[PDB]
Amino acid sequence: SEREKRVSNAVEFLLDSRVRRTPTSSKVHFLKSKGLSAEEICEAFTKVGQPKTLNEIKRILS
Ligand SMILES: COc1ccc(CN2CCc3c(c(C(=O)NCc4ccc(SC)cc4)nn3CCN)C2)c2ccccc12
Ligand code: NA
Numbered sequence: 102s103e104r105e106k107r108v109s110n111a112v113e114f115l116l117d118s119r120v121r122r123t124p125t126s127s128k129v130h131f132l133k134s135k136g137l138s139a140e141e142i143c144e145a146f147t148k149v150g151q152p153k154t155l156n157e158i159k160r161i162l163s
Contacts, residue, residue: 107137111145125153129161 111132114120120128132142139158146153 104141107135108141108145108148110135111137111142112148115145115149115151121151125157126161129158133162 114132115128129142132145133139137145139155139162143153143155143158146158
């Protein structure tokens with residue numbers, strides 16, 4: 102599915118060593134700009150073992 106593709110692409114991005122050391126805020130605003138919802142961003146962070154609360158993701162984006 103395209104939601105699965107968005108989340109899969111996000112996961113691979115969040116694993117990259119250069120991206121791990123980039124702040125959470127920057128990565129959340131960036132992934133929103135790539136067309137992910139807050140929920141999809143949240144799922145990607147959890148899948149890579151860097152879980153965030155959905156609240157944190159929505160607070161960054163708002
Ligand atoms: C905020 O910090 C940053 C932003 C952007 C970059 C630049 N990256 C260049 C290489 C690159 C990038 C992506 C990428 O954006 N992947 C996510 C994605 C999500 C959704 C869909 S839509 C299905 C497509 C893709 N995939 N590649 C190449 C191998 N993965 C982004 C940074 C580079 C270093 C450090 C911090 C960064
Ligand atoms: Na941050």
